[PDB]
Amino acid sequence: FTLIELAIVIVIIGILVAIAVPRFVDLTDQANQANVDATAAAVRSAYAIATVQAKG
Amino acid sequence: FTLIELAIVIVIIGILVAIAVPRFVDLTDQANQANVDATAAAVRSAYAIATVQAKG
């Protein structure tokens, strides 16, 4: 590579770095809560259906 | 209505049915006999009263 091409590369690397980038976040607490809540809704419906099947 | 309320209804209907209930009975024979007998008593009295009115 010519020295000019390396100079251009040295410039552009410095500009394509110094972007923002997202953090990874452990969102499993929020997702676990929604899983527990959705499951609780399912248990209530499953119970209601069971009261008809059981006739009691 | 909720599924629970319908389940409760399905239970209670099954218990308020399966009572006893009386048959209707054609008791007109027994009543007709009593009418004929009571009328026969009246005819005897009406006759007795008539024997006084008729003087014979």
From Swiss-Prot, chains A, B:
Post-translational modification: Glycosylated.
N-methylphenylalanine PTM positions: F1
Keywords: Cell inner membrane, Cell membrane, Cell outer membrane, Membrane, Methylation, Periplasm, Transmembrane, Transmembrane helix
Disruption phenotype: Deletion mutants show a defect in twitching motility while DNA uptake seems not affected.
Primary location group: membrane
Keyword Ion transport: no
GO cellular component term of the entry, any: plasma membrane
Domain of life of the organism encoding this protein: Bacteria
Location(s), subcellular: Cell inner membrane; Cell outer membrane; Periplasm
Residue ranges of the TM segments: 1-21
Function: Plays an essential role in forming the main structure of the narrow T4P pili that participates in twitching motility.
Name by which UniProt lists this protein: Type IV narrow pilus major component PilA5
Species per Swiss-Prot/TrEMBL record: Thermus thermophilus (strain ATCC BAA-163 / DSM 7039 / HB27)
